[PDB]
Amino acid sequence: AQADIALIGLAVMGQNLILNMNDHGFVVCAFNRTVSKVDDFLANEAKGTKVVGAQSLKEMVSKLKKPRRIILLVKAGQAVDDFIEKLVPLLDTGDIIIDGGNSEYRDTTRRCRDLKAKGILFVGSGVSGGEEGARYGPSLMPGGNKEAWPHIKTIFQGIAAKVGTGEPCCDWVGDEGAGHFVKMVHNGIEYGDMQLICEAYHLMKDVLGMAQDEMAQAFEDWNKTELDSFLIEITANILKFQDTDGKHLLPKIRDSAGQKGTGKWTAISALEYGVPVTLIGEAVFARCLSSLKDERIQASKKLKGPQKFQFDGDKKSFLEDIRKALYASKIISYAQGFMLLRQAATEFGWTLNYGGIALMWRGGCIIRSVFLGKIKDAFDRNPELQNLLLDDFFKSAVENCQDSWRRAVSTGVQAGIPMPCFTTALSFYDGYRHEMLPASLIQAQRDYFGAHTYELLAKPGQFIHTNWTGHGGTVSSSSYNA
Amino acid sequence: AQADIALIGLAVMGQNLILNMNDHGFVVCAFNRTVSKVDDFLANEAKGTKVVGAQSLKEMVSKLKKPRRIILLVKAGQAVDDFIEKLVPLLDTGDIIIDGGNSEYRDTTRRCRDLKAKGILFVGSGVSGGEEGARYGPSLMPGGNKEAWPHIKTIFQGIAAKVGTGEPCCDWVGDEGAGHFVKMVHNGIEYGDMQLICEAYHLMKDVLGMAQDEMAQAFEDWNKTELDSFLIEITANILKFQDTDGKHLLPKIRDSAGQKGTGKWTAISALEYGVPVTLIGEAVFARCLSSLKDERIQASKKLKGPQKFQFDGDKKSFLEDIRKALYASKIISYAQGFMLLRQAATEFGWTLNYGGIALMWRGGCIIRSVFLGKIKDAFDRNPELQNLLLDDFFKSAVENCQDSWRRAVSTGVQAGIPMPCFTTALSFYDGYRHEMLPASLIQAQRDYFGAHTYELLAKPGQFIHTNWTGHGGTVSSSSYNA
Numbered sequence: 009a010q011a012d013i014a015l016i017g018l019a020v021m022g023q024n025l026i027l028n029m030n031d032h033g034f035v036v037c038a039f040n041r042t043v044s045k046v047d048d049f050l051a052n053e054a055k056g057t058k059v060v061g062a063q064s065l066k067e068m069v070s071k072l073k074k075p076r077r078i079i080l081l082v083k084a085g086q087a088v089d090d091f092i093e094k095l096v097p098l099l100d101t102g103d104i105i106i107d108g109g110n111s112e113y114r115d116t117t118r119r120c121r122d123l124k125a126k127g128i129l130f131v132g133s134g135v136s137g138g139e140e141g142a143r144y145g146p147s148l149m150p151g152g153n154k155e156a157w158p159h160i161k162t163i164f165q166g167i168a169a170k171v172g173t174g175e176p177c178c179d180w181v182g183d184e185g186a187g188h189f190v191k192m193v194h195n196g197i198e199y200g201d202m203q204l205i206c207e208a209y210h211l212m213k214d215v216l217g218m219a220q221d222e223m224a225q226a227f228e229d230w231n232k233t234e235l236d237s238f239l240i241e242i243t244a245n246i247l248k249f250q251d252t253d254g255k256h257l258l259p260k261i262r263d264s265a266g267q268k269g270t271g272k273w274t275a276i277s278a279l280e281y282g283v284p285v286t287l288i289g290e291a292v293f294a295r296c297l298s299s300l301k302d303e304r305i306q307a308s309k310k311l312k313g314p315q316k317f318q319f320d321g322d323k324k325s326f327l328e329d330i331r332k333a334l335y336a337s338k339i340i341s342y343a344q345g346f347m348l349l350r351q352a353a354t355e356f357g358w359t360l361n362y363g364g365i366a367l368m369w370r371g372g373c374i375i376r377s378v379f380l381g382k383i384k385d386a387f388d389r390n391p392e393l394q395n396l397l398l399d400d401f402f403k404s405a406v407e408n409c410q411d412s413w414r415r416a417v418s419t420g421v422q423a424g425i426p427m428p429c430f431t432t433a434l435s436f437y438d439g440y441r442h443e444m445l446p447a448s449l450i451q452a453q454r455d456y457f458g459a460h461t462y463e464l465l466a467k468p469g470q471f472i473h474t475n476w477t478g479h480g481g482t483v484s485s486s487s488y489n490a
Numbered sequence: 491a492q493a494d495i496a497l498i499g500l501a502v503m504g505q506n507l508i509l510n511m512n513d514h515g516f517v518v519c520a521f522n523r524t525v526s527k528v529d530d531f532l533a534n535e536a537k538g539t540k541v542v543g544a545q546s547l548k549e550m551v552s553k554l555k556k557p558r559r560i561i562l563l564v565k566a567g568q569a570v571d572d573f574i575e576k577l578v579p580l581l582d583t584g585d586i587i588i589d590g591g592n593s594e595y596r597d598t599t600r601r602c603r604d605l606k607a608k609g610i611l612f613v614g615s616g617v618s619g620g621e622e623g624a625r626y627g628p629s630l631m632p633g634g635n636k637e638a639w640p641h642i643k644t645i646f647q648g649i650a651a652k653v654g655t656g657e658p659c660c661d662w663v664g665d666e667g668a669g670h671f672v673k674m675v676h677n678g679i680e681y682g683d684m685q686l687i688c689e690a691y692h693l694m695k696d697v698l699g700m701a702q703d704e705m706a707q708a709f710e711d712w713n714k715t716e717l718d719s720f721l722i723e724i725t726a727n728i729l730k731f732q733d734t735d736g737k738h739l740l741p742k743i744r745d746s747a748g749q750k751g752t753g754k755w756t757a758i759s760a761l762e763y764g765v766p767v768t769l770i771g772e773a774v775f776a777r778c779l780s781s782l783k784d785e786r787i788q789a790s791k792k793l794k795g796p797q798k799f800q801f802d803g804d805k806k807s808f809l810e811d812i813r814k815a816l817y818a819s820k821i822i823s824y825a826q827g828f829m830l831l832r833q834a835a836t837e838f839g840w841t842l843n844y845g846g847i848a849l850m851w852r853g854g855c856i857i858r859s860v861f862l863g864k865i866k867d868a869f870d871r872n873p874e875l876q877n878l879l880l881d882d883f884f885k886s887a888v889e890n891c892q893d894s895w896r897r898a899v900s901t902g903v904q905a906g907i908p909m910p911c912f913t914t915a916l917s918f919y920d921g922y923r924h925e926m927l928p929a930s931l932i933q934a935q936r937d938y939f940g941a942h943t944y945e946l947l948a949k950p951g952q953f954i955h956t957n958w959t960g961h962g963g964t965v966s967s968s969s970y971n972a
């Protein structure tokens with residue numbers, strides 16, 4: 009019983025998080041399905057550390073101080089269940105397993121309940137920050153069996169990104185799958201932000217005809233203002249980056265985006281619970297569309313765009329327009345994200361601290377933005393805040409960007425530039441701010457062909473069927489949603 | 491053994507389909523969970539028919555000619571499984587159960603396999619056309635256990651809508667859940683169409699300031715050309731329709747769209763299998779957004795739109811623009827739908843006849859369109875057609891609408907009119923026709939923060955990790971999708 013904690017999984021996240029814990033003075037026992045990788049790790053990256061290895065689960069468990077604490081950082085899915093099944097017979101009541109991978113929240117909820125019945129404390133925790141964050145200070149979103157929290161708080165908050173006054177970007181999120189749900193939403197917002205950034209870049213490149221380094225500079229400048237954020241920052245660096253041959257690397261890269269599930273899950277959750285998280289939807293679909301690379305090559309030969317477009321305006325003015333469009337859309341991204349969190353708390357009874365979640369994102373986090381503090385403030389003033397757009401800071405920002413936003417989109421449309429996210433964000437804003445929508449026509453159509461019934465504005469809750477054609481029956485469908 | 495067939499479920503679809511079969515000379519045994527409704531039906535709507543009723547399943551089954559044929563038209567979900575469980579003990583090998591409701595295809599696949607093992611032939615069939623279609627001639631999309639097809643073909647094709655030369659809008663779709671899958675896609679396309687129509691109506695109302703009856707006329711006119719279709723037709727009727735007090739009915743209707751699952755399922759399937767069916771996604775979320783009626787009233791108080799917009803152009807010219815925009819977007823809706831069908835065939839091994847499916851939609855069907863014949867022709871010319879937009883008829887149509895399309899959207903944007911479907915449709919067109927997309931930047935970002943690796947254009951399939959920051963490690967994540 010010499011090791012403070014064990015970690016399973018020796019890819020980018022596992023190796024780096026191990027070294028982080030080591031640097032903070034914790035003895036860590038490393039393990040991996042492919043056992044050869046343990047030795048390779050101890051002989052290289054962990055060469056001069058306190059890290060110890062195991063050749064088997066049995067051995068790994070035996071090295072742990074009680075209550076034993078084991079972290080899993082492996083590919084999400086069956087692998088996590090595989091390890092749990094093997095560990096349970098080796099563990100004692102009160103022992104703790106922490107899944108730090110990108111697992112679906114429903115899986116986490118299930119595992120949490122199963123293991124609790126067996127006396128084992130299960131934590132499902134989101135980890136943000138990628139390689140760098142794992143190595144030096146990640147954002148941690150722990151949820152599950154809170155009985156575990158007291159036994160992991162010290163390590164977790166110990167290694168977590170610290171901000172300003174030294175406050176850790178890691179606090180208990182809530183019960184069962186709450187941690188992984190929050191992490192899911194984190195990735196939804198991330199997907200959205202990345203896609204919007206791509207659309208800005210596409211406008212800079214193809215409407216304004218800017219050079220790679222010129223665009224790098226634009227992002228670098230944007231990073232000093234309201235758009236101050238991790239993603240804007242690295243985009244600037246990416247645009248600057250030169251390959252060993254002196255040419256820029258980005259233009260050499262294949263334009264087919266991968267995805268590993270979290271974005272998709274966010275969109276699916278939104279659909280299942282009826283939350284209009286439109287940006288994430290378009291972001292995921294945009295990745296799918298880019299995957300059709302071969303099709304797009306084919307299509308580019310037959311489908312023509314706007315034939316006669318030339319940008320005849322002030323490039324500098326339009327660049328600023330792009331900036332403001334990006335800012336407003338970024339705001340919608342986050343607002344939708346928080347709508348989804350609020351909906352989850354309602355669906356599952358999780359007591360989520362929205363302001364707190366915002367604070368956890370200030371460091372070691374992919375969606376770190378200068379305005380996360382503003383989000384916290386918003387929920388402080390009004391914990392029941394129904395939407396970020398209703399808070400003054402965000403309402404004002406969007407109001408100030410609105411003109412530029414519409415200008416950028418209209419121009420984009422005229423130029424033939426794909427802006428799935430810019431447009432969906434604006435459509436959402438325009439939809440959400442409208443007291444009357446044409447959805448009443450949808451109701452009329454449904455009642456007309458399917459007898460689904462509808463309600464009058466003047467008396468909501470009472471459903472009616474109308475004999476639209478004058479030749480229909482009286483027997484209608486029932487009024488229900490599904 | 492006097493009845494030819496039984497049907498369970500006495501709401502709009504069931505009552506009407508029973509009367510349809512009765513008119514074609516088939517003796518039908520009616521049943522329902524709430525048995526009192528059986529007698530009510532025989533005493534009223536079926537008062538002068540050959541319909542017979544049962545007071546129990548046992549009694550209903552005993553009235554059927556072998557092989558026994560039972561149709562289920564009840565609310566999708568558990569209720570279907572409930573009846574199957576109760577029926578199986580009463581049935582003989584070779585008997586046939588037909589689920590005509592809007593069931594999820596995965597449920598249908600499962601039921602089909604389970605019952606096959608028990609000697610019972612299961613058909614899952616989509617039914618289109620609503621009340622009027624059920625009553626006089628529906629589109630029928632039968633799939634499941636093909637051993638049943640010969641035993642139901644006569645009745646099914648008998649009551650199905652007939653087109654032109656008298657060909658029935660009903661043929662065998664494919665194995666297991668294929669029928670219900672096709673039906674799901676049908677509803678996806680339908681949701682998309684309806685939402686597009688609402689957006690055109692919104693533009694007519696709020697940009698062009700047209701009167702109800704004037705807009706009614708516009709749709710009536712549009713229904714004579716390329717937009718000739720069921721939904722355009724009924725929209726014209728709905729706009730004209732006056733309540734008992736002489737005022738138009740539509741403006742009295744509450745602005746909150748319901749949904750019963752199929753649209754949502756389509757979008758989810760699309761996400762799960764990586765097909766960019768963007769229109770259905772926006773259509774479903776638009777309904778969700780409309781449901782936030784109370785929130786929208788609140789938001790309309792705080793969130794301002796474009797302050798200084800006045801339409802200063804030719805109304806007639808812009809009305810035509812809207813028409814062309816609608817047409818192009820409608821085309822995208824169907825194109826996306828068939829991409830999903832193609833994907834399903836691949837995923838599940840279903841041998842789907844795309845042209846045949848288009849033909850089934852020509853009558854008694856909510857998405858009846860004048861150009862369904864064109865879709866059939868396209869797949870005739872090229873059964874491997876990867877996308878409708880690649881066919882000359884559709885390529886040309888979109889090419890001719892393109893200008894008006896962008897004009898409509900750009901104007902809509904400036905006026906502050908929500909166009910989630912118009913804009914997603916156009917974004918998708920612009921994305922799909924582009925050989926190069928900014929997705930390369932997403933790949934760069936992913937590799938930069940998460941070491942997800944990427945490929946070079948010049949050598950696809952070989953994944954690389956780059957040390958973007960110059961201070962990172964060599965251990966990356968693995969390259970995989972999920």
Ligand SMILES: NC(=O)c1ccc[n+]([C@@H]2O[C@H](COP(=O)([O-])OP(=O)(O)OC[C@H]3O[C@@H](n4cnc5c(N)ncnc54)[C@H](OP(=O)(O)O)[C@@H]3O)[C@@H](O)[C@H]2O)c1
Pocket residue numbers: 457458459484485486487498499500501502503504522523524525527563564565566568569572590591592593617618619620621750
């Ligand atoms: N309405 C349309 O235009 C449309 C078009 C095509 C297909 N469909 C599908 O066809 C099916 C029938 O649609 P519909 O609109 O006619 O009726 P519905 O409103 O969807 O369902 C009402 C029928 O389902 C029965 N039912 C509800 N819950 C039940 C339960 N728990 N156990 C047993 N029976 C139950 C009701 O029986 P009780 O009388 O005892 O309550 C009634 O007979 C549905 O699956 C629908 O999705 C609908």
Ligand SMILES: NC(=O)c1ccc[n+]([C@@H]2O[C@H](COP(=O)([O-])OP(=O)(O)OC[C@H]3O[C@@H](n4cnc5c(N)ncnc54)[C@H](OP(=O)(O)O)[C@@H]3O)[C@@H](O)[C@H]2O)c1
Pocket residue numbers: 016017018019020021022040041042045081082083084086087088090108109110111135136137138139939940941966967968969
């Ligand atoms: N990469 C990131 O920037 C990022 C950021 C935050 C969180 N995460 C999440 O954290 C976890 C680790 O991510 P990662 O990128 O470091 O690695 P990864 O590529 O997602 O997974 C590789 C690790 O999982 C193990 N593994 C794969 N399949 C397995 C199976 N069937 N049974 C047992 N182990 C299996 C591998 O073991 P072997 O060596 O034996 O093959 C290896 O240790 C993932 O769940 C990921 O979603 C990733």
Ligand SMILES: [Cl-]
Pocket residue numbers: 110136195
């Ligand atoms: Cl991640």
Ligand SMILES: [Cl-]
Pocket residue numbers: 179180
């Ligand atoms: Cl605490």
Ligand SMILES: [Cl-]
Pocket residue numbers: 310
């Ligand atoms: Cl050609």
Ligand SMILES: [Cl-]
Pocket residue numbers: 592677
């Ligand atoms: Cl339907």
Ligand SMILES: [Cl-]
Pocket residue numbers: 662
């Ligand atoms: Cl045949």
Ligand SMILES: [Cl-]
Pocket residue numbers: 792
């Ligand atoms: Cl106010």
